[PDB]
Amino acid sequence: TLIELMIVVAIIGILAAIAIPQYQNYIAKSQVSRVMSETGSLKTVIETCILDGKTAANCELGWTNSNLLG
Amino acid sequence: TLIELMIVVAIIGILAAIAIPQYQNYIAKSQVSRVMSETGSLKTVIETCILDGKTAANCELGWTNSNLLG
Amino acid sequence: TLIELMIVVAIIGILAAIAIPQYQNYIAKSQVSRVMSETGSLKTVIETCILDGKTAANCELGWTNSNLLG
Amino acid sequence: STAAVTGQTGLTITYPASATESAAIQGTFGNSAAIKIKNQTLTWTRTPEGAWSCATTVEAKFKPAGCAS
Amino acid sequence: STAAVTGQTGLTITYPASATESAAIQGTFGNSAAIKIKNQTLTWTRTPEGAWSCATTVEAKFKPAGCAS
Amino acid sequence: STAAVTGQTGLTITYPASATESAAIQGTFGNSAAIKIKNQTLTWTRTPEGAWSCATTVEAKFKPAGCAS
Amino acid sequence: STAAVTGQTGLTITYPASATESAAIQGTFGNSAAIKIKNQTLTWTRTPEGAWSCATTVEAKFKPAGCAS
Amino acid sequence: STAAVTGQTGLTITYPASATESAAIQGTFGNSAAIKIKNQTLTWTRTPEGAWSCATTVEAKFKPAGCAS
Amino acid sequence: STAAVTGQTGLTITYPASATESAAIQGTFGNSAAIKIKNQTLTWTRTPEGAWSCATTVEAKFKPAGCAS
């Protein structure tokens, strides 16, 4: 019957119009937290270099490339 | 067909009704543990001040502000 | 749209079946190392007592109760 | 800063002035802490003999193994 | 690599040369980061007294609780 | 808290009484330890010559490099 | 779009202010909804312990299996 | 709800008491579940060494790839 | 199990021996994996200096952002 197909179309339209939350906030917060942790990991070596009295060129960082540019 | 859409709606209902594992415990325990570590870090300076004989005003803390008030 | 829900269910099943490493090893090793350090801290006082000539009852231990029985 | 006065209102120190009283470092939760524990305290107390121990007023299920009364 | 020159363009180190300067570890987003935060920065600053703090130029809703100042 | 009578039952001190005996500090796990290592022990033994060494009855994979004996 | 002020009038959030209050997210139907359920509500309530549950004032025929409470 | 007694009759926990026994988290189906799988069980078993695995008594047709043992 | 021999045929470990070669953790897909990526590999390589990196032979559109090398 036609009314059943129309109800199916209405259900499809209802499902297609679901409210999508702003997922950008989630990913942005996760990336910022990861960059925070990665940059804070260097505080140990920086503090040891400063307290040892070494220069900028003589301070060896164990830094590895991060897929996030930070 | 209508039955397929009703099955989809039922699956959506099952997925939306998942049980939340009550995550408050994990966050609270982690915060309490980090406060434990932060406050225990001051035991060294407090003990050195006490064993040195300094007064309360003459004991220099290395304390920095903590995002948790503790 | 049923295939989308089936793909979602498959992804949920894939995520739920992640391989959990034997985390018992890390915790056991950390606890054993901590007990090692606490027990080795008493070597100083034991050695001083022995080299001083004191008896077992006259050797004062600065031992504090450890949440690990060791 | 100093034991007499610190830079944070949530951290207090009871510093002994004689040989028969105990020392204490107390921290009160807040700011970025969870609402459930927004006003509880965690304290490290030191007896005059020189023994340190921890205590807290949070619920048992939140206590770590090191501060179980 | 070293503090003077690093192997990544997005990471910079401001190393103090005297007792009155402050150290800095700055990281600029990009590459695989989100487009919205593509050119923002997150920095760790160390005062000459030896106190570390975090700051960032990202929007408020993206900041974690640690770097909210 | 003395060598003859320790504070807790999990710690035992074997104190030499002559010039030919060896000293020992033994700790049995328990309380807040893992269930797998609940009743194992870790000992520091000192020969009469004055040499200290460590032994443990826990599984090999849990042994730190110091007490791999 | 914050908890205090949502984007639309059909969504309300009761945000706890103390450790003894329960959070709530309430949504009232309308607009494109059916006439029969035009002014009903569906709410997600969170106890102070941290347990979430769902409830609704719609008739039992239209209630999904997850909110039949 | 604790390991000794849970708040639901359909979920049970077998908690080890020694280092030589395994742990189990078992859950039966019911009420909102389908009639076909009404009284089947799904269990997570943890060996004494610390390895987790999943099993179920439901037909292999309904078995997800994770618990197809 | 061990680095020399593992309990799974799809996981291999290349262990350094001469202090100048790289370490490798390689995993070949299969079993419950998709047919398209049934025989590809994903590897973690550690340089002698101590730097870890990831690589994979799967197609570009299936690669995560981390292993896009």
Residue numbers in the entry:
A (entry chain CA), B (entry chain BA), C (entry chain AA): 9 to 78
D (entry chain BB), E (entry chain CB), F (entry chain AB), G (entry chain FB), H (entry chain EB), I (entry chain DB): 79 to 147
Original paper wording:
Single-stranded RNA bacteriophages (ssRNA phages) are positive-sense RNA viruses that have shown specificity for gram-negative bacteria by exploiting host retractile pili, including T4P6. Acinetobacters have type IV pili (T4P), which are involved in twitching motility, surface adhesion, biofilm formation, and natural transformation in gram-negative bacteria. Our study delves into the interaction between Acinetobacter phage AP205 and type IV pili. Using cryo-electron microscopy, we solve structures of the AP205 virion with an asymmetric dimer of maturation proteins, the native Acinetobacter type IV pili bearing a distinct post-translational pilin cleavage, and the pili-bound AP205 showing its maturation proteins adapted to pilin modifications, allowing each phage to bind to one or two pili.
Using single-particle cryo-EM and helical reconstruction, we obtain a high-resolution structure of the purified straight T4P at 2.5 Å resolution and model the mature pilin into the cryo-EM density. The mature T4P pilin subunits have a distinct “lollipop” shape, presenting a globular C-terminal β-sheet domain and two N-terminal α-helices. They assemble into a 60Å-wide filament, with a helical rise of 10.0 Å and a twist angle of 91.9°. The β-sheet domain is exposed on the outside, while the α-helices are buried within the center of the filament. Within our helical reconstruction of A. gp16 T4P, additional density corresponding to potential glycans was observed. These glycans are added post-translationally to the last amino acid Ser147 of the mature pilin. Surprisingly, a 13-Å gap in the density of the polypeptide chain is observed between Gly78 and Ser79. This indicates that, in addition to the post-translational cleavage at the N-terminus to remove the signal peptide involving the first seven amino acids in the prepilin, there is another cleavage in the middle of the peptide chain, a phenomenon not reported for other pilins. While the precise mechanism behind such pilin cleavage remains undiscovered, the fact that it takes place on the external surface of T4P suggests a direct influence on its interactions with the environment, such as its engagements with the immune system or phages.
